[PDB]
Design a protein around this ligand. Structure first.
Ligand SMILES: CSc1cnccc1CC(=O)N1CCC[C@H](C(N)=O)C1
Ligand SMILES: [Zn+2]
Length: 139
């Protein structure tokens, strides 16, 4: 579980999106595992507009924040699940770190703000869905 609350938007993993999210849909992309819904309240999460490759992510399976080196956003192949068949997920960034299935939605942050959210993982690796290219979240 976990979401980004910026302005009148709620950013979540598409596979973990609720009924309310689909009823207040703004934009969704299965290949990125992202879904954006609208909110009445005004969020204050600052989104990073950078090319940082180091940050800190929240791991709910350990109740700890971990510092990570992470890769540039790219097309990384992801194995089949009850949410998506086997495919290439775009705008994905990998880091060496701990993750479990309940960890999806944890925020990744740098000195510039919110980079993205936990989306994939396994084998000692953790994947983050980047949100820095989504410029419309601010405007
Ligand atoms: C941190 S998630 C995780 C971590 N360890 C083992 C397993 C996982 C689960 C996992 O990777 N995914 C299942 C749910 C959808 C995901 C996606 N974005 O396509 C992929
Ligand atoms: Zn940054």
């Amino acid at each position: 579980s976990g979401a980004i609350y910026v302005g009148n938007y709620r950013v979540v993993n598409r596979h973990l999106a609720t009924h309310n999210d689909w009823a207040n849909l703004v934009w969704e992309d299965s290949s990125r595992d992202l879904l954006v819904s609208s909110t009445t309240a005004q969020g204050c999460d600052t989104i990073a507009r950078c090319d940082c490759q180091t940050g800190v992510y929240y791991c709910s399976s350990r109740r700890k924040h971990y510092p990570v080196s992470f890769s540039k956003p790219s097309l990384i192949f992801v194995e089949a699940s009850e949410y998506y068949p086997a495919r290439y997920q775009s705008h994905l960034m990998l880091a060496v770190g701990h993750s479990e299935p309940g960890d999806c939605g944890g925020i990744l942050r740098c000195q510039h703000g919110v980079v993205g959210i936990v989306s994939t993982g396994g084998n000692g690796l953790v994947g983050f869905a980047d949100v820095r290219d989504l410029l419309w979240l601010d405007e």
